[PDB]
Amino acid sequence: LIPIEFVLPTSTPETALLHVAGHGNVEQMKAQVWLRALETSVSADFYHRLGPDHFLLLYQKKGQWYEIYDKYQVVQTLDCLRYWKVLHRSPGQIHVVQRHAPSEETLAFQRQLNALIGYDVTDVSNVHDDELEFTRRRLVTPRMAEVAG
Amino acid sequence: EEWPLVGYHEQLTIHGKDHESVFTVSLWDCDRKFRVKIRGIDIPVLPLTVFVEANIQYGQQVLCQRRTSPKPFTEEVLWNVWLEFSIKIKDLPKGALLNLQIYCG
Amino acid sequence: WVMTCAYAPSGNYVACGGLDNICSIYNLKTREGNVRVSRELAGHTGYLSCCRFLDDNQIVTSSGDTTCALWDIETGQQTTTFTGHTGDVMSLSLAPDTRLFVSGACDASAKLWDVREGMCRQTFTGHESDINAICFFPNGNAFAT
Amino acid sequence: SILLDNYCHPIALPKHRPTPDPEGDRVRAEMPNQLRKQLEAIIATDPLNPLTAEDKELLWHFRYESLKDPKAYPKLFSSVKWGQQEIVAKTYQLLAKREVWDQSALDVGLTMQLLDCNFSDENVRAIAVQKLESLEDDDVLHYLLQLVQAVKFEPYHDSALARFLLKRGLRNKRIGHFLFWFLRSEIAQSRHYQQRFAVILEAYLRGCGTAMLHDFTQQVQVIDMLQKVTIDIKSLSSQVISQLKQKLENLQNL
């Protein structure tokens, strides 16, 4: 029932005020937001064309952006909620952003790195789980702090 | 770089809850025994007697041991058998290794 | 890590204990004639250091929690608790009269206890180090440490 | 193939809660100088000491005596039984009061036994790495080969030793260079862990500066060309020498 006003991917930009089922976890909120976008939105055709994987849930913490990578995370593990309660941000806002494809700069950089290493890092042909890719998405923040320091 | 940056036993137990408000089951409530299903093996080509042995391990430790019986040395073999472990599902440590050893004779 | 044992005067029971912090009482004359554990005298917070049977139903035990205790085998409960020691209690010895017993500790001192009441009657010193063993003089008016 | 029986709900092991454990709190006097004398003779043995279940017992009961003796730690946790659930709760309450380890003497010939094969826990290695955090750059450099060789045993991919190497390579350059070359050698060799090392190395190469990237690139090019020439040469008199000269001159041209 937690009220969260969502920044919609498309429009003045349109924002949807909901009552998130915070009892469960992020999956419930995903289903609720999907249905609300399907029904309320005047541009509901846009999102009807697009499937579920064409949008991501990013939230602004202290200015930067964080990813809700695991839907299995429970509501309490969503630090955004506690952050808002301390800041009393009711309703909170989670930016529903539209996905995008990689650019050529990134692809060339990755090929360079893979040449240096001698072995692809984006290979997913010998893994029975996403341990590796989550290791990679997690090592970022320690590296950003190390470099900033 | 554009890549955006990515409980305890009291809150995650069945006891004290109605089944219709249950979503998780702590690994310690499970008093049962660990058991595995070894359906079989299939190799494109064999590069005598043969038989499996499964183990749980925690840092070169062998908490429990299990095995099976001799079998024909084909390119593919089946049991659908179950192997049950002594260690309860609440006794498992975070980091157990399920070793799977095809021996031959 | 058993550390002590004590044949009962009756001859029916034997007790032992150690690191387990429990005085496990064993029955030699069991219904089936096997060696079955009658009781697990738990409650001590340290290793069981020594124990002596008063009878088939009573037994005194010392431990590493710096206290002694009288037990009732039936209830498995510390009848009396002998507080006052400031060190791990290594040994004890029942007088011929079961109403008094002494106990030796690492504080280089011994203490005379009243089994009936549970008080320290006298405290003897003189040792420069831990007391490892203690027992009553045959008559019961003296003891060596 | 295998099947692990399913569950309508997922099985989420929590992490042990450390709570006031007063067996250490209110056992504070000193123990029999006999027991201490038979314990501290065992502790002062080789680090290859076989701990008999006798020894593991005597030490597992004296679990606040050997908590102020760092020279005993890889003999204390070599006894803890990991097959149970109360044992591990007690051992995760034992490590909750460690004021005689953090402020101990930073002996790094010891911390290299809390990061060995026999230990796979998630906090034994954490205290080991906490000890190593206070080393200095040259000290790190001296042993870095084994620290690399000591990320193989980290049961998972993401761990604390790996993040340690990462954080070390982004504030020095000699460390960065030698780390790069060792990780590259293993990725080219350690097929078993090559994916893990590749993850580590690539997470490293996004932080260093552009110039270091270019220097790596050029070194890699030179080694590659030299490997080509070498493999060509060992395909088989003075004609071979002249062919060496021709290939080297062309490489200069290439």
Added chain:
Amino acid sequence: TEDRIQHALERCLHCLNCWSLQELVSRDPGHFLILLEQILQKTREVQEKGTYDLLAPLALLFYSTVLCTPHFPPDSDLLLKAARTYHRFLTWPVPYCSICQELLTFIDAELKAPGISYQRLVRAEQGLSTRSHRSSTVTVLLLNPVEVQAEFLDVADKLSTPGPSPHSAYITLLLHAFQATFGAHCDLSGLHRRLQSKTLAELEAIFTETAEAQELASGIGDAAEARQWLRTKLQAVGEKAGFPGVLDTAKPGKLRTIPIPVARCYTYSWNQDSFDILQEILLKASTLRVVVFGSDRISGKVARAYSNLRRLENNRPLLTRFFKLQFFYVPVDISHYLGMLDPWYERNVLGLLPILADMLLYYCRFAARPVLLQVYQTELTFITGEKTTEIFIHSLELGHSAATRAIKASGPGSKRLEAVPLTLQIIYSKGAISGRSRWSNMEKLCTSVNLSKATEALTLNLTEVVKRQFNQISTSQIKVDKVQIIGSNSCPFAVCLDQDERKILQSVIRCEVSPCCLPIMTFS
């Protein structure tokens, strides 16, 4: 009584014993609480010992018993104790947790509303409908006289007879409804006599005002409150009704086992194998129960009509617009296959008013576990270019065997009417457990091709002719799941599906094979 029930239970889970025990308990209502306590204790013996085997029979026994128990003491702890017993199984594999969650829902219904389950089940069975909550579970029987057995025919005839009446059904349901709640403070005879004098229309108005509270009280969180507020609801109803003093009497009114009024059973003779009979019967919120007798040959026909009906109704839902289909198999090769597999099936329903018809009005109400065989989708091609994907379910045939079948199934023609080999291309995928399929391709001079049973696997009898003259035959069975047969237009072959001659097909140039509401059921 206590020890006899316990020992009969020990016999129950080790062929008619299930029945002996339902009867024994049905005698005196006391027995029910004894059996329930015993079951519970045994289910904790399993909650703590192991042997998953014994969870399903015990859950079924508890469900069956509590389903008819005439009344539970208001102070009894049996249901809450049972809830605590089955709330510890969630840490078991699937489906045990599913079984137990469903059973706990049933216990929730019990506490929150007594006698709700029995009243719902019967009101579905008897076709009586409230203006709002309509229910119909009509069991129709399919029987071919010459295939079915005498006794069975007698059972069908008896079931066809409309034993119960709407007025008698309403009387019985009001009786059980008042006796589950009030129990010993209600004198059966009393009500029953202040009832028969009434009329069908009012008996309905009442049984409706009753069932409605039996629901509204079930759907509330305070099962104990809901309970007393339902005793109170029924009391406030029975006062107006006109039988006051019958209920809430300071005498120890005795309890008795009110039976289960049999459901609306219709019989229709099956001089057919197609399920068009079912649509024709239809031409004459709800479910439909179809029960059929299992002969050996009938197997093929039955499964082929299963496939035909499924695909037909997929093309256009007609029989699935108001009724949900439930098909039951009764033994009299699949019978052998299921006989040795499920010990509960081999104990209760494999062997089998009369005992047979009680165990058949029993089996049919409880079993809800669909166990299905891998239907095999096969698309054929002809010289004319006709392509369709009709299924066979037991075996397939091709070559000269199907032609022989037609040769003899022609009757008039079979009185007026060597295996030339077939140069055919065989492309079969030897399946791999790990998912690494292995392709192998040949062209061989084979006469007849016979797909037979072993996701599932398909064994295939090949009949190779190395030489014509008494053709040579080298029969080899090879496991295959996806098999492609290519046959030149100038080599049409006699293909038969399911061994039934009614579907012997010719002119085929190509046959593609690959493993793929109305369920068929299995007891456990």
